[PDB]
DNA sequence: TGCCGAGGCCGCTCAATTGGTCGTAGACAGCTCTAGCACCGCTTAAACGCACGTACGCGCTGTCCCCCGCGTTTTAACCGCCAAGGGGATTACTCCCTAGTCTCCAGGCACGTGTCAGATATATACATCCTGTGCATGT
DNA sequence: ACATGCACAGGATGTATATATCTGACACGTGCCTGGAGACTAGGGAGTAATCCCCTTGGCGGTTAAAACGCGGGGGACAGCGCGTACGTGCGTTTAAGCGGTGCTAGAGCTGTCTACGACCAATTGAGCGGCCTCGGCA
């Protein structure tokens, strides 16, 4: 029963650090 | 800084490294209240030129740097003499 | 309403337009008090109480 | 604090769009309705109708609320002053 | 499934309509009981539009009877027809 | 009879025991018969009044005076007096809609 | 003189009947300012009745429907 | 009776909000119906609207007499106005979700045609009913 | 002893039978658009912790309306005039009604844009430094 709240765990803790890294990169030129 | 102060006090920096740091020399500034206070282990002061002023404004770069010994202008006054 | 629009910067008139017409002036107000135009919004207004100082 | 609650009123006396979310309000018409009869159905405008009259009553009530509020003096409001504005205006009583 | 979905009713969309309304500090007993104040609403337009609704024979409800309930209860719309 | 001069704002409660029971109109007809012209002329010269139109008016002129003062003691007691005073009556007159 | 025929101690008198302890001396003259707007509001409407029905004698039915249009409506006239 | 301190003035520094420009796509006017069903025609269809006339009865204008409006001084409760307290609503953060767009299924229901039966308006005679009226009567 | 309540006469009122048909309840075709759920997406919101500042609180204090009270004017109560209202009445003008004619205004279409809807950049107005200067000041 818990695999699919795991899946929505995993995919937003990459999601989370993937946006803020992504903006960083944007960001620093 | 002035701005962000609790936001830069979220972090245990190890080195606040000041450039040009005549900006701190007049001690009446909200700049230098704040600046003598952050926590940090060490310090620099990176001047083109230090103090070069009367002897209130060599008193608020040397508090900066150490908080020893400048207990008051007084002293610091005693201290070619 | 078009001279809501007009002061708005648009010429296509929508609900806020005619709504902020309907509530600027007292005689549509006073006529129009049992009724919401819709997505028209209400218009803006703050008490002098809430006001700065 | 409190200066950005004023160019929040200021934002929201600008903009004209549904202040309550859509979905949640669709569920919660249909909730209610399923007990004045079994299984409604409702065509798409109609919730919005729903919405748009329950969100008008709202805003006409914190307005008149405001005006409650305003004349004790006090800024912030409580149910002390709703419990005036209804049975004022004249929905209780 | 069924429940007591009033608390869809989300507590920034009670700040904002308040807001939209002026006034400036919302106090911890506000919200709940606006939640039931609006369910009363809700409540009385909802069996009004049924009714309409029940003579017309529908199990669909549409914004005509919605409309025609708000006209009863004198908080007439304008927007949707009617 | 017994508490007689019983503390100063409650022979007022004395009052309203008398009012609230009894069937009267509080202002006197002759005056307000009078007014009820004066009102009228205005907009057309030379009006007559039923002697029943005059009573119609008083009637429903009262009891829109007694409604308004009964929601303006509302508006006194949730500002903590029991003193009515003229704000209360702008409050009640604003959210009935009949002054916005 | 005929607005004052609403008497000082009439306004007390109404709102004593009205439920209300005590009356601040700024009250009267503002609320025979209301008792006037909303009698001169039914009064005009009224006439306005009476007169497309041609007659010149305010009449119980002129007066209970302009105060039927308005909302504060009164039984016992013969609605 | 020699020498400085604290504070005001005039000006830069840099960070918040605001008004204006560029573009792409939602939903406008502009067709262009086709299409059919609204809006306008002539007369005859009746009655309801309309004007004089005046019996008939309620509304103004003076009654005459006891009560209410008006005004003051008094008094204890209240409201004007305040300082100060500490409860609590605003505050930013990092946490999570479910609101919204969309793509599609697939089903239940709302709708329109064709039908016919049984319902009511119209029109008359049927037959019994409610009212204005005189003046009795009950609390 | 007054407002409400008693039975008779009058005159029309509600009624029962009738001719003629269109309103509307029904089965069926219709076929939309709503109900549904999932994948996908990330903007919005949930809950906690910080702490400023607000509403409540107890209070000082004044001054206000209620309270008690009397003077004199005017509200409340009948006769007398006359002017309006409700009909009586026939006239005649008003719209209703038959159902064609045919105009444009309708649903729904398709059209090409093209205002104004997002999203980005360059304005004007805000509190904190910096050095000058004088006034106020001490020894």
Redesign the interface.
Same mark, same amino acid.
């Given at each position: 029963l818990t695999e699919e709240m795991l899946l929505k765990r995993e995919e937003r803790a990459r999601k989370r650090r993937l946006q803020a890294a992504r903006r960083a990169e944007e960001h620093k030129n | 800084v002035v701005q962000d102060v609790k936001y830069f006090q979220r972090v245990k920096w190890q080195y606040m490294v000041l450039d040009e740091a005549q900006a701190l020399k007049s001690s009446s500034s909200v700049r230098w209240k704040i600046l003598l206070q952050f926590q940090c282990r060490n310090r620099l002061l990176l001047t083109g030129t230090p103090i070069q002023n009367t002897m209130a404004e060599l008193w608020a770069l040397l508090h900066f740097i150490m908080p020893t010994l400048f207990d008051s202008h007084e002293e610091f006054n005693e201290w070619e003499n | 309403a078009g001279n809501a629009a007009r002061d708005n910067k648009k010429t296509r008139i929508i609900?806020?337009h005619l709504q902020l017409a309907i509530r600027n002036d007292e005689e549509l107000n006073k006529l129009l008090?049992?009724?919401? %135009?819709? +997505?028209?919004?209400? !218009?803006?207004? %703050? +008490?002098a109480? !809430?006001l700065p100082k | 604090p409190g200066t950005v609650a004023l160019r929040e009123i200021r934002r929201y006396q600008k903009s004209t769009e549904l202040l309550i979310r859509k979905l949640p309000f669709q569920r919660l018409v249909r909730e209610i309705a399923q007990d004045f009869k079994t299984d409604l159905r409702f065509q798409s405008s109609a919730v919005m109708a729903l919405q748009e009259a329950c969100e008008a009553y709202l805003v006409g009530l914190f307005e008149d609320t405001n005006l409650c509020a305003i004349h004790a003096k006090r800024v912030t409001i409580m149910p002390k002053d709703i419990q005036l504005a209804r049975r004022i205006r004249g929905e209780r009583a | 499934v069924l429940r007591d979905n009033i608390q869809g009713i989300t507590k920034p969309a009670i700040r904002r309509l308040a807001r939209r309304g002026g006034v400036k500090r919302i106090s911890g007993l506000i919200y709940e009981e606006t939640r039931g104040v609006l369910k009363v609403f809700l409540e009385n337009v909802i069996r009004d539009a049924v009714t309409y609704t029940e003579h017309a024979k529908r199990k669909t409800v549409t914004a005509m009877d919605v409309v025609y309930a708000l006209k009863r209860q004198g908080r007439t719309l304008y927007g949707f027809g009617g």
């Open positions: - | - | 609900p806020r008090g049992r009724v919401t %135009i819709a +997505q028209g919004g209400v !218009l803006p207004n %703050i +008490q109480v !809430l | - | -």
